[PDB]
Each structure stands twice: as C-alpha cells, then as structure tokens.
Amino acid sequence: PTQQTTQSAFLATTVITAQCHAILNTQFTPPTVKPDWFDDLSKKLDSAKLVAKQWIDDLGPQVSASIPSSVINFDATFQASIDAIHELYKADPTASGKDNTTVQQASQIMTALSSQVSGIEATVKGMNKELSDWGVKMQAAHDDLVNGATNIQKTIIDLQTDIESMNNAIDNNRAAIEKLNKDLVYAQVAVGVGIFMLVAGVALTVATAGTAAAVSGGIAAVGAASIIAGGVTWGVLQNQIDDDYDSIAQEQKQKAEDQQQIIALQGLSNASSAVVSAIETSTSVLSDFETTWTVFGNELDDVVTKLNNGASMQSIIMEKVMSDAAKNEWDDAVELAKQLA
Amino acid sequence: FLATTVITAQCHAILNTQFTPPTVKPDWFDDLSKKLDSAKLVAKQWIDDLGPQVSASIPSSVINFDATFQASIDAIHELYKADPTASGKDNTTVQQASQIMTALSSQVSGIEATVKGMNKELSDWGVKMQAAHDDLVNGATNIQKTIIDLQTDIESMNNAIDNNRAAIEKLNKDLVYAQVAVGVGIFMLVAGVALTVATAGTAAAVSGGIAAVGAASIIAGGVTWGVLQNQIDDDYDSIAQEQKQKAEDQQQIIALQGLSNASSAVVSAIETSTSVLSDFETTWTVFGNELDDVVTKLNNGASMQSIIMEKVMSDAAKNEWDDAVELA
Amino acid sequence: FLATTVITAQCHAILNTQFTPPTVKPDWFDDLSKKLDSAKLVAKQWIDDLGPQVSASIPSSVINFDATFQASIDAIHELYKADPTASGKDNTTVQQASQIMTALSSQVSGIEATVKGMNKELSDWGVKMQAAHDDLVNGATNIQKTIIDLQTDIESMNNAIDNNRAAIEKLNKDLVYAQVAVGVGIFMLVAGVALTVATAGTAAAVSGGIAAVGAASIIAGGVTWGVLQNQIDDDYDSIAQEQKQKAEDQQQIIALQGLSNASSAVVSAIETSTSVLSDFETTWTVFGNELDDVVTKLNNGASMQSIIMEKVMSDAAKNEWDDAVELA
Amino acid sequence: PTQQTTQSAFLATTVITAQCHAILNTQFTPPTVKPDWFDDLSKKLDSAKLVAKQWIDDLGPQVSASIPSSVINFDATFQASIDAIHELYKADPTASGKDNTTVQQASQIMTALSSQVSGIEATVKGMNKELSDWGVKMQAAHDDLVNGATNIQKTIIDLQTDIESMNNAIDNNRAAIEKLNKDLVYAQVAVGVGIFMLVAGVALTVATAGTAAAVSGGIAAVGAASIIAGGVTWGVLQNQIDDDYDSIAQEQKQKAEDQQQIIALQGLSNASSAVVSAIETSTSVLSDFETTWTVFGNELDDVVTKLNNGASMQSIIMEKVMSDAAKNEWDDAVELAKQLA
C-alpha cells in the first residue's frame, strides 16, 4: 500500500533523531597532559555537535510535522469529502455536463480538496527542503572528520601507539622494580655485616688494648664503609622504587585516559557515519513520499477536470477514488500514522 | 510505551540517588556533587513545573472539546440541515455559520499558542538536560583516575610487603649467624681462660688472642643480635602497616567503584531521557500541527461552508481526542 | 557444502571457544578478552539478526510467488487465451493487463528493496568481521612473544642450575680443605701448647708461634666450614627454587600453547567465514539482480502485454522458485 | 560453446576474489622498534587494502552480477519468446510480405528481444567497465609496492640479514655466558679462599703480636681484598648473565618478529602477484564474454531485419538462431550459470 512508504520515511528520520543524540552525548574529557590533536579535534566535534543541535529542537520535532501530520491532515478532509458527495447523491445522481448548481458546488469543493493536498505536498516540500539543507550542513560538519585532522586515520593509530608506548613503559618499570628488589636484598645484607664488622673491629681494638689495632681498625673501617654503602643504597633504591611506582601510576592513568578517548572517538565517528548513511535514505524516501502525494494531487486534479467536463454522479462511483474502497485503506493508513506517534 | 511515564521513571531515578563519599574525600567529590545537584535542579523543574504543565495542557484540550466544540459543530450541522441549497458569502445563514466558524478558529488560536510555547518550554529543558549530562560525565573521569591511582598504591604496598617478607627471611638467616657468633665467642672465651689457667700462663699470647676474639665476637654478635631483632620487629610493624593500608585503600576502591557505578547510571538515565524527549517532541509537534490544522480551518468558501469544514473540524477533534486520552 | 550452514557453524564455533588465562595473568589478557568479546558481538550479531534474516527472506519470496504471482499469471493468461488480438493503449483488456501488472510490479518493490538492502547489511558485517579479525591477530602475536620470553627464562634457569651444580661440586671439594685445616690446626695447637709448657722456665716464643698458627687454623677452618656448609645448603635451596621456576614456566608455556591454538582456531574460522561470505554474496547479487529483473519487467508495452512480458515474469519467477528452495 | 566461456570467465574472477581475500588477510604485526621500511609499507599495504576493499564490498560481487545473472535475465526471454511464435504459427504459418499483424507482431517481439539482448550486453559493458577501472587501480597499487621501496627485493633481503645478525648475536651471547660461567667459578674460589685467610690473618694477628703480626696483617689484608674482589666479581657476573639473558630474550623476540614479517610479506607478494597475473585474463575473457553477446546481438539483428523484410514463418524455424537444440544448449547455459552460484 501507500502506508509502507510513510512508515519507511518516518523510520529513517527517527533513526536520525536517535543518532543525533548519540553524537551529542559524545563529549570526551580534558586530559591531565593535553596532546597536540586535542584542540583541533574539539572544534570539529562542536561543529558536529551544533548541527546536531539543529536536529534536537528545530528539525527533529519538525520532521514529525511532515510524515504523520500531513497524512492525518489529508484524511481529515478525506473523511469529509465522501459524506459530502454521498449526501448530494440523493438529490441529483443523474446531473451531468455542469448543469445543476450542486454538482458545480461539489466540483469547486473537490477543487479546494486538490488545493488542500497541494498544501499537504507543499508542507512536505518545505520539510524536505529544511531536511536537505541541514543535511548539507551536517555532512559538511561530518566529512572534515574524514579528510583533515582525521580522528581515525591519524588519532586512532596515534593513540594506539601511545597505549603501546605506555604498556612498554609499564613493562620496563616493572622489570626495573624487580631488579631493584634484588638489589635491595644486597643493601640489607651489606648493612647487617656492616653492623657486625664495625662492632667486631672496635671490640678487637679495645679488647687487645690496641696491640692489633691495624687489622682491627681495618675491620672497623670496612664495617663502617659497609654501613654507609648499605644505608645510602637502601635509601636510594627505596626512593627509586617509590618514583618508579609513581611513574607507573602516571602512565597507567595516561593509558586509561587514552582508552577513554578512543572509545569516545570511535563512537563519534560511527554515529556520524551512520547519520550520513541514513540521511541519504531518509532524503530519498522522503522524496518518494513527497512525489506520492504530489501525483495523488494531480490524480485528484484529473478527476476534478473530468468531473467539470461531463461526469455523472454515478460515474464517480465508477471511479475508484471517492468510494469506500480507498478511504478504507487510508483509514488504516492513519491508524498506522497513529501507531507511529 | 507511554513516553511520559518513561521520563517520570528517569527523573525519579535522578531525583532518587545521592552518592556518599569515600573515607577520604578527594578534591573533586563535592564538585561531582555540584555536577549532580544541578541535575537535581532540573528533574524537579520537570516534575514540579513541566510535569504539571503536561498534566494541565490536556484538560484545556479535552474539556473545551467536550462542551464547546460538540455544540459548535452541531450548530453548523443544523445550519446545513436548515437550508442545504443556500449560497453566497453575503447570505444571512452563511454569515450566521461564518461568525461561529471564525470564532472557534480564533479561540483555538490561544490553545495553539500555549501548545507551541510548550515546545519551546520542552526544548530549552532538553538542551539543559544535555548540558547537565555532559558536565556530569565530564566530572566522572576523576573517579577512574583515583581508582587506578589507588590500584597502583595497592601494587606498591604488595611489592613492599613482598620485600619485607624477603627481608624477614634474610634477617632470620643472619640472626642465626649472630647467635652462632655469640656462641662460638663464649666458647673460645672460656677456652682462652681455661687454656691460660691450665698452662699456668705459659700459653699467654695464644690464649690471650683466643680470648680476645672471643670477647670481640660476643659483643659484636650481641649488638648484631639486638640490631637484627629490632629490625625484624620494625619490618613486622611495616608489614602490618602496609597490609592495613592495602585493606583500607582496597575499601576505597569498592567505595569509588560504587560511586562510578552511580554516576554511570545517572548519565545513562539522561542518555535515555534525550531519546524519550525526542519521541515526545515528535508527538508534541504532531499535536501542534493538528491545532495548526484547526486554525487553518478558518477557511470560508462561498457556497455552504458547513460540510466542507466542520466534518474536518470534528475529525481533527477526534484525532486529538484519541491521542490525548492515550496521554491521560 | 551449503554456504549458510558453514557460516552458522563457524559463528557457533566462535561462540563456544573462550580461552583461559595463564597463572601469571598478563597485562594484555584483558585486551585479548576485549578482542574476543568484540568478535563474539560480531558473531552473535550475525547469528541473532542476520541469521533469522536469511531464514525470513526466503518465505517472503515463496509465499508472494505462491499465490500472488500465480493469480497474476493466471489472470493475464486468461486474457491472452481468451483475447489474443487486442491492441492500442486505450483498449480495456490491455488496461486490465497494465492494472494487474502495475499492481504486481509495484507490490514487489518493498520485497525487492529489502533483498537489495541486505547486500549492504551483509557488507557492513563483513567490514566488522575483518575489523574484529585484525585486532585479534595483533593481540595473538603477544602469545608467541611471551612464549619466546618464557623459553629463554627456561634457558636461564637451566644455566643457573648448572652453575649451582658446579659450585656445589667445588664447595664439596673445598670442605675437605676446611676440615683438614681444622685437623692440622688442632694438631699444631696441641703441639705448640705442649712446646710452650715444656719450656716454661726459659723463654720460647718459637714454641709460642706453633700454637698461634694452630689456633688460627682451627678458627679459620671452623668459620669456613660453617660458611661453605651454609653456602652448600643455600645452593641446594637455590637449585630447588630455580627448578620450581622451571617447572612453573614449563607449566605456563603449555597453557600459552593452548591459548595460541584457541586464537589460531578463531582466526582460521574467521578466514573461512570471510571466504564463504563472498561465496554467499555471489548468489545474493544473483537474487538482487533477479528482483531487479522485475524492474526490467515493469516496462510495459501497449499492444497485448501478456505475450510480451508475462511468460518472462513466469520464467524469471521459476528461476527464483528454484533458488529459494535451494536456500532451504 | 556459449556457456563454457561464461564459466571460464567466472573461474577467472573467483580466483581474483580469493586472492583478494588473501590480500586482505595479510596484516603484519607491529614490532618493538619500527624499522625504516615500515611507515611507508604500512600505507602501501593499507592503500593496497582499500582498492582491494573495493573488490570485497561491491565490485567483486558486481562482476558476479555480469555473468551469472545476465544468463537468467536472458533466458527469461529466450525460454519465453520462442513459444510465443509457436502459437502465432497456428494462424499464418507461411505469410510473408508484412501482410499480417501477426507477422508484424512476431517481428516486433524479435526487436524486443534485440533490445533486451542489447540491454544485457550493456549491463555486461557496465560491469566490465567497473572491472576495467578496478583492474587498472589494482595495477596502480601493485606498481608502487613492487617497485618503490620493494618489499621483496629490498626488505626480504634486509630482514634476512637482520635475522643473520640476530643469529650471530645470539651465538655470541651464549659463548659469552659460557665464558662468564667459568669466570664465576674463579670468583667463587676467590671469595672462598679469601674468607679463610681473612679470619686466619685476624686470628694470627691477635695471637702472635710481633713482626709475625705484620705478616699476619698482610694475610688478613689480602684476605679482605680477596673477599671484596671475589664478591663484587660474583655480583657483577650474575648481573652480566641476567642482562645477557635479557639480551637473548630481545634478540629471540626480534628474530621471531622478523620471521613473522617475512612470512606475511611472502603471503602478500603471492596474493598480489596472483591477483595481477589473473586480472588481465579476467578482463580479457570477460571482454570475450562481452563480444560473445555482441556477436549474438548482430546474429539476432540480422535475423530481425530478415524477419522484417523478406522471411517466412517456416524460415524462422529453419535458422539456427531460433532453433531448439541450440535452445537446449541455452538451457544448459542457465543450469551451468546456476551451478556457478
């Protein structure tokens, strides 16, 4: 029927009303350290945001004035034309050739019906034009993401090699912390034998009254040197372990920020590409929906002119249009349009 | 599938939750509260201003279409039935129908204006909800920053506890050497004294040297025993303190994971609220153009304007009727 | 050899292989889990949506050609068997033929548009399949990365075990020297102290040097006996620790070989799926062009369109009658 | 015959789509250090994916619109319109000179078959034109890979010499670790002798106290020197062996990465050369398939102008164009083109 181009023209526009929100909700965080690409990819988001602004409060609501509202507006008069002709059937169902006044009255009322459906297709024309030039603005705010300062071709590869760089740094710092543990055990052994050799040296110096003070002073001096070496090595290695874990924290939150950036950029790119790919089908099927009502207006024009020429009132029942067999289909079409709202 | 109850449920969830701090509150937390309560400004400004307006715009369009519109259609219907052969705009009866037609199409213009103003009243509230979503999801990255920072802190405390346990093992194995030092020192001290007494002091230098390394070994092993035992107590206290810090910051991880789950739930709620506002604006501009239709039903013809406009009036009234009672 | 059964079997093979982490859970196994669950999302998006799409496109092409096409061919076969001579555009019989043919060739338009849109609905899925393939391979090279790393870890622990065994043999040789140092030392100590007590009345420090070198020999031999014995026990504990590391690394390498075989089976299934996908697009373009043939059939003549177009519709529809029962 | 060239041109293009899938399978992994040839042969891969991606989405399936669907659309009429003239033979089986409307209609049905066959070979021209531009773009992507910074003539050779470098460095490092094992044995006997003569020298110094104390302090001094020298030699050699096995890890991972890159570049070269050595046969035999329908177009059009001007109705059966054994071959053609599906 004609209902399945109405539902298809409404569905491909509700897809855009949904996915403009997917573009507009995409808003990534300012990082700790700000990269090079961050500013000149932000404005190309805002241009891709503001035109989606023109789909959330201006054109998104207005595309519902086109597809359900013009069909129910046409059927509001198409529920009135049939009874107005069916009442005048009882007066003169034989009057032909533009003779009786009521036949010419019904003729100019169906001419007003043709002007009403011409206004229907004019409303759909205005809505399709306001869809199309916004589509040029949204596509112009889209294709800059794929031509210059691209999110995919440059920054996805850049943030992937940045995530790999931070993973490499994390691996190097963890192997470094392993080696510093293996050196810290040596520092503790050195300060232990330093304690022992220092007290043994000064004890052999005192306990022999300095008769062997050369070798005992040597033992005490190597003990004090081992104390100092183990102590400052322990302090230095613990400072390097703490600074290595601070570096692990820094590049770990850097890798987290880069993952949060790539998911937002992939969402923005996929939403904008699907918005363009569905705006194409939306404009095409709205063009078919506009020409459907335009050729139906021309068909009603041909019926009006052939009714002005010579057509009998029973020849209108010989026609398909003003009977019950088409208004019964379009009652289901407006029931579908009430399902679509 | 009623898209007003969906926004009712989402704003109920947004007005519902109020997230609690962790044990130590960071620098952004109250600011995250300052990115929540502004949303707690709008979700009541929906349900105490625009929630009342969506429950007060429909009794203006069901009651004034129950009494005024039905009789005002019946009047022009009976004016059709009184003379179905009339013509002309300067007719008496066509004038009597045209005054009521222009009056009804002029008094639906005010309710048209308030419905078209309701579009603007929902528009700015929708963009404000979008902005309050984007500021809250802007603040909700510091939670992941502090979570991954405290995860690094947990890894650092695990490394330090492993280091201190290896130090406990090595200091036990060296404390054995300090005890062996005082043992062999006490033995060779009494060996030097007994060898000096037994040889009547003739083995003076040898047993004096044995006793000298004996005393040096007992006081050196004693000081090394005291220092290594004190160090073992110190890094047992360090193991206890770093295990306590690991449990405490792990508790902070669960607290901030609950906070991040709450903030993710609230921003997903506004994420769905934007699509449900899109569908409600779809239905609302359908109703606004339905009343635009009733205003463009001011069109008056020349001959018998009654059946050419008033059945369209009643049919658009019925299309408003079924949808507004679905919104009731 | 049925191409759709091949791809549904391969997608269910992607669904039933999840892979297990090794003992030390690395820093990339969460990323490999992300690559697998994205490939699972692609395989389940094909199984849950495009799967029933292929199985629901065919009864829509059978049922509409069961009765709706056959009533059309029966009607415009009656119009040719009863009146094969009528011509001219305003003729009533060719008007009936053009009415039922602009009914059929424009009621097939939605079904043709669906079957034509499924070409792009397959193409974006093939793009997502080759997308989920390559990041999975870039994650699965890290398998043999750590496999090579644990292989040289095995080599390092084997070299260190051989080093500790050579050190154990040399220390078990040097213990004999420390023990003969204690023996010769206690012999020279008792000889030197006997030599000093036998020379008490005069002086003999020549006798007092033998006992000094004997006492230093027992002290030095005892200290290195203790140190070399504790180093032997330390080297046995090091052989035990390195053999434990070698056993656990050999245990981890076969888990990594299993994970490598899992990622290899998944990428092999994706490759045969992406080839049989092109073999399915091979016939999907055939059915797309076959429903484009009805667009070629919509061009109607003026003079007895039955003998011009209707058996063409019957022959192409019978080719679709072959194909749609070949797809089930 | 008239079907086996269609099957041969289809066997020519399934080879193209299979080796194009072999091109799309080729994606080599990023190494730890990205060499000189990478950053170009990334995009010289990647662009040689994108034009190859044109075969994957549409154009490969669109050359599968040329052969196996046009035979169906051709015997939509050729299995049809032979039996239309068989009922026209019932009225006038010999009437010539354009006297009847039946002969004038059997003429225009053959002109309709002429326009249908011309539309078939025009669809074949469109699909072979798309194959022509895809084939020259595939040659355009093959040229810069196989000539400018050649993957096989340069980087296969440079990677083989890099593998030889890593092999010689691995054997060098394992010889160094064997030498370091022997030097470790010497350092262990150094510290083992040094502890003995240290404590022997200190016990001799504390016992003797003469010039024997001077030579005993010498013994203890060379003992402490041997302890410190053997100890730092032991520690330095364990440090060197651990760093050297980390070097063995680095070189073995580099050798495995290089073997993976060589296998990927061998697969790329085999796939792209098998594409380019078959795409010219694909265009040549699809041009053969187009000129087969062009020969069929003139071989129908001469029958058409003879049937218009001076043919009988038995003479249509007499010619082999409208014959039935050849039409049995042209039902075998449809069964073959459906077997190719």
Numbering used by the authors:
A (entry chain B), D (entry chain D): 10 to 350
B (entry chain A), C (entry chain C): 19 to 346
Quote the study that presented this structure, word for word.
Using Caenorhabditis elegans and Danio rerio (zebrafish) as host models for bacterial predatory interactions and infection in aqueous environments, respectively, we obtained evidence for a new V. cholerae cytotoxin denoted MakA (motility-associated killing factor A). The crystal structure of MakA revealed that it belongs to the ClyA α-PFT family, named after the potent, one-component, PFT ClyA which is expressed from a monocistronic operon in Escherichia coli. Our recent studies of the proteins encoded by the mak genes in V. cholerae demonstrated that MakA can form a tripartite cytolytic complex with MakB and MakE, whereas neither of the three proteins displays cytolytic activity on their own.
One repeating element of the right-handed spiral consists of 37 tetramers that complete five turns around the helical axis, spanning a length of 216.5 Å and a diameter of 322 Å. This arrangement results in an axial rise of 5.85 Å per subunit and a helical twist of 48.65°. Application of these initially calculated values with local searches in a 3D refinement further optimized symmetry parameters and resulted in a cryo-EM map at an overall resolution of 3.7 Å. The building blocks of this filament are formed by two MakA dimers that organize into a pinecone-like architecture, spiraling around a central cavity. Interestingly, the annular density is located between the TMHs of MakA, indicating that the active toxin form interacts with lipid vesicles and starts to oligomerize by internalizing membrane lipids. Interestingly, despite certain similarities, all four copies of MakA adopt different conformations within the tetramer, as indicated by MakA-1 to MakA-4. In MakA-2 and MakA-4, this region superimposes well with the crystal structure, whereas helix α6 of MakA-1 and MakA-3 moves by almost 10 Å to extend the length of α5.
